[PDB]
């Protein structure tokens, strides 16, 4: 589809996100990022996420995001302006949560590759930090 009906979906409906990133597989295990987040057609994005932290033997970190987003080529191209740790603590550290939250800094700017699963599903490609699945009620 063109960019600008790629552009039209996006910013018709609210969206929520989920992406999984797997550490160990045999200290921190796994990472689930749930997010909601908003596309305005003026070409700002706000965007809440939920940071979970699964180390074996579970804690969470709330982030607000602002900034610009953009479609080019069928790819979700965004650059964050702003971070704010919203969340109102746990079994990590100040610095562990702090380098977490740069890793997540990190991937809030790939830019990422749009394909439709179904109606209410889109999965978000990047070229070497994995998917990230956009889904509507």
Request: charged fraction near 35%; avoid cysteine; glycine fraction near 0%.
């Given at each position: 589809m063109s960019d600008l009906k790629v552009e039209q979906v996006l910013t018709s409906n609210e969206w929520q996100s989920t992406m999984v990133t797997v550490i160990?597989?045999?200290?921190?295990?796994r990472v689930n990022v749930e997010s909601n987040v908003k596309y305005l057609p003026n070409g700002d994005y706000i965007r809440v996420s939920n940071i979970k932290l699964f180390a074996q033997g579970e804690s969470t970190i709330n982030i607000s995001e602002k900034g610009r987003w953009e479609v080019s080529d069928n790819y979700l191209l965004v650059s964050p302006s702003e971070f704010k740790d919203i969340s109102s603590s746990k079994d990590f550290s100040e610095a562990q949560l702090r380098l977490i939250t740069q890793i997540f800094k990190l991937d809030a700017e790939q830019s990422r590759r749009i394909d439709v699963v179904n109606e209410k599903t889109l999965l978000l490609t990047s070229l070497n930090h994995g998917s990230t699945v956009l889904f509507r009620n």
């Open positions: 160990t597989d045999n200290p921190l295990r």
